[model samples]
Target: EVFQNETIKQILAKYRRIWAIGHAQSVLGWDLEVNMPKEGILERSVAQGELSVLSHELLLHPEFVNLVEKAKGLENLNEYERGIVRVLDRSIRIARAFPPEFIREVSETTSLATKAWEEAKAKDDFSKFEPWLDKIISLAKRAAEYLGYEEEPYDALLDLYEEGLRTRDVEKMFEVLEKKLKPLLDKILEEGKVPREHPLEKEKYEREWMERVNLWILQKFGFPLGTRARLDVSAHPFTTEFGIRDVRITTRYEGYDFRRTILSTVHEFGHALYELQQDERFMFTPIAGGVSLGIHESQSRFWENIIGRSKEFVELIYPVLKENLPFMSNYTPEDVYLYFNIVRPDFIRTEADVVTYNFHILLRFKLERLMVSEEIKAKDLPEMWNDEMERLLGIRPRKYSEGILQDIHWAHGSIGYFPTYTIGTLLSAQLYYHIKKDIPDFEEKVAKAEFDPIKAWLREKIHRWGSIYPPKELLKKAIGEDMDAEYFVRWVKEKYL
Candidate 1:
């Protein structure tokens, strides 16, 4: 029987209410981060707190539990459909273990914590928000315990956002990538330089062009006209899924700087495309969530890095890009390609070069672990952050916002999400390696401005099905072999080393 059965439909209907509240909260979150006036912070905190509590209630609903338990014993459920049941079972197990009061407290505290963080970032005072940051870490560890884990307590929190990926696996991958990228970056420092020439600087891309260019590329990636997606400016660019159908992506633009705005759009659209690809079979079911943030990040990185940064991609898209930005008309395709991919340790990770991006993530990783494990004092994070930036990337942040407050993860209590950015980047490179190997005309097609072939390949094998398989299995299927950071590192060697 289809989910349209009255009982099943009703359960999903109730979930839709939960989705609506979550969606509203998400939009408010973007507003809070991006454009909320100073006077609105208090009211916004109250609103977010109330909605968060409501979300907790819906998550803890009696009917939600019943549907999940019933789903487990449904005899005729297909494997694909059964995957939904399994995911629901996993969620219910974790949700039921936590005291509702615990979640409520964290929810309420988070709103204020984030506000404090904003203030602290502005004033460059870690003391203002350090207590709350510490509390968030402790709460995360407690939640991890309730969720249960083996081998590594950290893995429990890690798996919440990125399934089946462990701290050890990530450690190994990042370690290899670290060795390869850092040394290569050093040599590139000694090599001849990129032509610092491009016309689409901050002031060049008018919002009209910003919106128009974003819309145009998104259409090429299979999001058609009338797609229920909107691209708006936000402090941090992200895509949030509301139920199975509505996915919104935001890009934070700097009219004077083209890099952040354009890349953010590209990154967020990667997420939107992944959501848009989920099969109808898994919609509204418990198992329908994105498989893991790592996989999700891989999809985004694949599009943003492997495709968007490719020599062939530049060869194809540069003409159009130049056509629009006549100022960049003098920079040839190769120059544009080199400019985009040049590696360096920049002040902002989002604006950092590709080779050094993960080093930014690595700093976050080390710091988050220390905070969670209580190895370091939260109040002293700014100083510690400065020390490490100087140690690792060789440049300390000029300010706290450029340093500790640069990422929203801790302020909002997302402790385990950052590693996936680098992990997914490595996986994306590996996947692209296979994609090019399998799809003979892949590079040739991109040189011709044709992405339909590669997009279709990802749709069939990776994107369309969502979390039909877990992460390891999904990567294996996508690339026709198991994954290690080897291919990713090799791709780096080929690209620049």
Candidate 2:
């Protein structure tokens, strides 16, 4: 009914079967992160491998392929129809590029690699994960070649995550970010007046209290906590959706830094909110979720950095923190604001402040490029990671856990995913620039906990379309321009300088 053309309708029907299998795989994947027993991985991996191949087969079937091709040439296709074809065409091409066996291998390997990464990170041993990393890099390289590329092989991989993003575009964006952010970081480091240690840092908050506060903040942000979405704890914070209505997110609790849990919860909630806000008609279709990872990251970073760390948000949450955690009684709201916005360099990417976070991403982006290009191997990653950290942040990581083993991306075979974090960060500021103009009282709304207007703004401008447009096109449509780093630099100067 959504598509009048019989061909497009048939394509949607077949793609729904594929989407249903993916839905099963996603539930399994989310469980693997949040609830799966360590010993249960092998069997789960086998199940995931089969489902991945099943989905791939459904997408590649001659009937489905012919329908997609037919839909391509159909005259007078609307944007939604065109988007369905575009998304399926890309998936079909990617499915054709890799052999079925390769798909199974990647599914199984990445599943097991996640467990290996957990152990390696826990023990601070890169050697534990090195072989797995090597396997992943090998598969990633093959994937690039199979998918094909115009410039560098990495471009093919980047396209997997960002949809038409290239290594050169990333390089140019990072160049501008580095040029502006590096000097800003220097000025802030020399002139910023936040304390090196705060009273809140010395105390360990109860997990129950943290969860309560996180839930409270999420509810304030208009997330349907119990009905539509739920939050749980995981090694790393992430958001997953079974469908638009059944979204799940996870955050970690370190017991000491309350900000870690709260901020990550807010970040993952941003991701969930995007899924929760998508047009319900698009569910189970190719356009059900976010258009691209960069755009997805923009949603999370917009909520996480643009709103979460703002002085107004700090004021809104200050009373709740004081009421729930007695230690907050010792620090003023301004102190909490300063703590949240501290610009110190950190070994962990998730824990990195806004000012220095992209350096973490930049380091991973470069290393991933080298690994894919065969200029560096997994065995050399530790030294290279340390060297890059030192060169970029002026501090060397002392251990593998703090350096090479910190992220789960490499082990999970997400090679081209790192650049999106910076991309999202820059885009978040760009979105913020527009939101301020459109809302005019955005800061006042945050300070008063009036989030409905903010959520409605994002829903109208970004969420409702889903993948009805390409990533860049969706952004331009929302903001009336392409992504610009100047907004992010300007925001940083105004906030930190």
Candidate 3:
């Protein structure tokens, strides 16, 4: 049970220290989003910045890098050991790319920017957060330079999230999506029948009642609600994990249009399940989490759009909605299904319908390329965002909240993260196509509220491996093919048309 290679042993010992520090940072981050007061930013930012610098130093230690290089040449290591070396090597290279001061500044600035984003979003004012956005973009440009890209600076940032993703690949994939999806979207808009008004859309539910319903939905979908996993309210919905057994998710309550609360909860549950189901043997090591953001998004989009929006799922939940909220007593299961599947072009990306969702990502992808290329400034974002929105989705925002301030990603210094949503959306459809083949009675099981089989299938095929393989290799192993836009295009046509 012990590693014989001294180099491997030393590398693990050093990497574990860095992982422990990161684990502490994750807990503090969750608390900051869930419970911290607006006044707590000064001290919290300092603490976070210090932790980031400490981790950076630990990874860039000369002895640690030498041990990692030595382990790379060892041939007797197992797959997990090789994976550890691969992940840590990439981490060390990234750490070596930047100075410690740069790391501290990004950590501190992003921490402060998140607070400003909250206030700006609440006030619907982009000017309040404009200077922070300018700072973040400036930092991102420097980051691309340090990371070193071949063609576009944006490719460097893109690889940070998806690992090997480049600007050209994104452009090509988006080109296919736009060519296939745009015509289909226009056809749907022209011929589709709008659903009648429903009480769930108009009636306001109590926050406490909605919370209870959200928990019930998660439990029904096989999430360990009160035991290993928990949900809280946050400005933006996200999932975080301290370890395999301790995972948390958050969703905001809008009071009306309860679908937002319900679907967001389910979406986050998809993310939590991935962490909860990871191979426990590697719990505290470098290979213990989801492989990449694209794969992680595939899980969330899989549950949110493909499964959560299906007619069978609506049928299964409609009875409970009627029982819990009394106002749903007038609508049929078919009515709820139509309500869930309404295809409309909307301003907010998070709440946009499935049919028009990728367009939002496409717009962000184009603007982000411009941002990284220095072709656009922070002051130009509002006008540029509105123009692209109108061109792509045929809608313009009336305020900053619906326009540039809707997402917290850029505030948190996350450029090149938006495109992964569409990448994962495409992967979700590809996975669903295979799931129907593997689980022959997929719709019947969903209608009967039998989720353990589905959960077990996912664990066997996807979740149990953790990060042992690269993202693309992991996906090809799961779906037997590379990512294709055709699956998503066909899925939209089949469901909507």
* Model 3 segments more than 4 A misplaced: 1-6, 35-43, 104-135, 194-199
Models sorted by lDDT, best on top? 2, 3, 1
- State the displacement of the C-alpha of residue 294, model 3, in Å, after optimal TM-score superposition: 1.0
The digit string of per-residue lDDT tens for model 1 on 1-497 reads 54534445555677777767876887787777667887999899889978876776776788877876776766766656566566656656766777878877787778789999888888877788889987887888888788788767677777877777677876787787668767776666667554323443434566666576666666665564355666667766888776457777888656655655666677777777777767666665544656877878888888788777888766666656765664575667776676667666767877776777888888887777666655567777888888988877889888778888877678888888888888788878878867777787887887676767776777787776576677788778666676577777777778875
RMSD (Å) of each candidate, 1 decimal: 3.5, 2.3, 2.5
Q: For residues 1-497, what per-residue lDDT tens digits would candidate 2 score against the true structure?
A: 45677788888887878888888988999999999999999999889978876877788899999998988998788888889999888888877987868877997899899999999899988888989998999999999999999999999999988988999988888888889888888878876465445666768888888888888898898889789998888887899989988999999889987888888888888888899999987877887788888889899989999999999999999989988897877889998888888778889887788888989999899888999986567888889989999988899999888898888888888999889888899999999989899899999999998999999998999999898888888877878888888888999999876
Candidates in order have lDDT scores of 0.73, 0.87, 0.86
Comparing candidate 1 with candidate 3, which one achieves the higher lDDT?
A: 3
Per-residue lDDT value at 157 in model 1: 74
Q: Which regions of candidate 1 fall more than 4 Å away from where they truly are?
A: 1-55, 73-76, 193-203, 242-246, 287-289, 480-482
**Which consecutive 10 residues in model 1 have the weakest lDDT in total?**
194-203
Tell me how far the alpha carbon of residue 242 in candidate 3 is from the true structure, in angstroms, after superposition. 1.3
Ranking of predictions according to TM-score: 2, 3, 1
Q: After superposition, how far is residue 221 of candidate 2 from its true place, in Å?
A: 1.6
Candidate 2 colliding pairs, count: 0
lDDT value, candidate 3, whole model: 0.86
The C-alpha TM-scores of every prediction are 0.86, 0.93, 0.92
